[PDB]
Amino acid sequence: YNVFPRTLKWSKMNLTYRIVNYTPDMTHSEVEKAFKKAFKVWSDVTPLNFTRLHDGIADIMISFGIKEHGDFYPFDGPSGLLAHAFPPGPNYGGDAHFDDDETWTSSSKGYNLFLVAAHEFGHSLGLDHSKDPGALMFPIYTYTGKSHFMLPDDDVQGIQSLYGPGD
Ligand SMILES: O=C(OCc1ccccc1)c1cn2c(=O)n(Cc3ccccc3)c(=O)cc2s1
Ligand SMILES: [Ca+2]
Ligand SMILES: [Ca+2]
Ligand SMILES: [Ca+2]
Ligand SMILES: [Zn+2]
Numbered sequence: 001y002n003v004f005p006r007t008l009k010w011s012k013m014n015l016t017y018r019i020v021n022y023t024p025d026m027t028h029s030e031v032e033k034a035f036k037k038a039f040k041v042w043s044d045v046t047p048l049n050f051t052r053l054h055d056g057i058a059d060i061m062i063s064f065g066i067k068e069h070g071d072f073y074p075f076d077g078p079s080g081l082l083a084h085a086f087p088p089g090p091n092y093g094g095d096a097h098f099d100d101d102e103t104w105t106s107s108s109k110g111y112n113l114f115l116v117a118a119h120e121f122g123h124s125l126g127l128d129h130s131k132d133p134g135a136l137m138f139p140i141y142t143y144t145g146k147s148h149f150m151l152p153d154d155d156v157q158g159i160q161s162l163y164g165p166g167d
């Protein structure tokens with residue numbers, strides 16, 4: 001017999017993602033770079049590894065859409081809900097949807113795709129929202145103006161509670 005796992009986490013360390021479509025706001029290359037860096041945020045502090053697929057079903061299916069886009073979490077135009085992602089699991093599990101009514105950038109203007117993706121992939125991996133305003137997993141986007149990204153300790157603790165450290 002088998003009982004359901006008690007924790008919403010990935011039970012495999014080598015995970016796949018696929019960019020199902022692209023925002024008009026950034027080049028294919030910039031979008032790819034943003035997501036790759038966002039995954040690195042998590043792989044840097046856990047044993048998880050991430051590989052991009054160009055076809056088929058990946059663990060984390062990434063897409064851009066607006067308003068109603070095929071689930072119970074419709075978007076709302078500019079600002080507000082920026083994106084959402086499903087907890088670890090089969091099918092919809094892990095998938096990450098981005099609101100293309102946002103202005104996505106690789107800069108400090110609009111919403112930084114890398115930053116929002118890092119947050120969303122947190123959800124994809126099993127983290128809910130933090131109550132710490134300084135945490136990556138805090139619900140509200142607050143770009144600090146700082147030059148280099150650093151994953152806050154709250155988020156390190158959260159993700160390691162599920163997977164432990166890389167080594
Ligand atoms: O706002 C946040 O978390 C909450 C959230 C994020 C995304 C979507 C919804 C909610 C965070 C913002 N930041 C940062 O602006 N910076 C500085 C920085 C960022 C990008 C590139 C370079 C340097 C950090 O190092 C860390 C964080 S965490
Ligand atoms: Ca929105
Ligand atoms: Ca999935
Ligand atoms: Ca857009
Ligand atoms: Zn959605």
Ligand SMILES: [Zn+2]
Pocket residue numbers: 119120123129138139
């Ligand atoms: Zn969130």
